[PDB]
Design a protein around this ligand. Sequence first.
Ligand code: 37U
Ligand code: NA
Ligand code: NA
Lengths: 11, 28, 250
Amino acid sequence: GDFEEIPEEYL
Amino acid sequence: EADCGLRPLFEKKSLEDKTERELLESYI
Amino acid sequence: IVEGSDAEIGMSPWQVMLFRKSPQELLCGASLISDRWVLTAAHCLLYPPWDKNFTENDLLVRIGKHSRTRYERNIEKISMLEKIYIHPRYNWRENLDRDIALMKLKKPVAFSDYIHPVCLPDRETAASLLQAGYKGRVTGWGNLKETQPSVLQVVNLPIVERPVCKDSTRIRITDNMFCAGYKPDEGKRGDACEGDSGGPFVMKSPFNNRWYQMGIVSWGEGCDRDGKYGFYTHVFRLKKWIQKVIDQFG
Ligand SMILES: N[C@H](Cc1ccccc1)C(=O)N1CCC[C@H]1C(=O)NCc1cccc(F)c1
Ligand code: NA
Ligand code: NA
């Protein structure tokens, strides 16, 4: 959970 | 592939990383 | 990785991060073997004793990474999985025999300074390099001890004699595995650990100066314990399967 949000588009 | 296993920032530039020589020295 | 060092930039451009979509987190390591195929450990994907059974749409592949947690803008590439292939004789019930799986990517990844495939060994390279005392390299973003790194960690480890592998454990070891690590008397230490699973064990061939992936991080009892060794899937031994899959599903 220390993971930086990734660009929504890969979700 | 044709180019597999050759790192752009190392083998392709004829640069060695800091510990690859430890592997070579083990290959006796 | 226990007792390793931070990687150099571009030192392992075949390193792949298996990433869970929700909750967002590291699952495992993996490797890039062509512009569309990623190699990992089956146990990363399927391990019923832990209620693990991931489908394509549960995961993503992150390629070209250095930082564990950071989103590496203009450098990493994030890919979606088209299809997962697990070895049909993967032994999750007993000893993780044939601990190997392929993942096919929805789109080809673009190679760069930081993204580049590793080679898979031919019979002759394997016969020449997989010798007791010869060292390989293992890489990953897993734990630094048995009860997290900022960047990719790297450690060089010698292949261990099969009798020593066998006598170090009660688990049944197979010809589809090898073990690596320093002996207690050897002083030096290091090992893979939790979260390093599925990552590559690589060797640099002295005959053609190319990196070859000889193993996959598979299992170990503890991490960096004296008298214990990490166990690796023997990639060459399963190559026939790998080629069938790729030859079959392009
Ligand atoms: N601790 C078990 C030992 C084992 C081996 C075979 C069958 C069942 C249990 C294990 O390593 N497992 C349990 C299933 C996943 C794998 C693991 O944690 N592998 C990660 C790892 C840690 C440490 C060293 C290494 F090379 C790999
Ligand atoms: Na034993
Ligand atoms: Na050990």
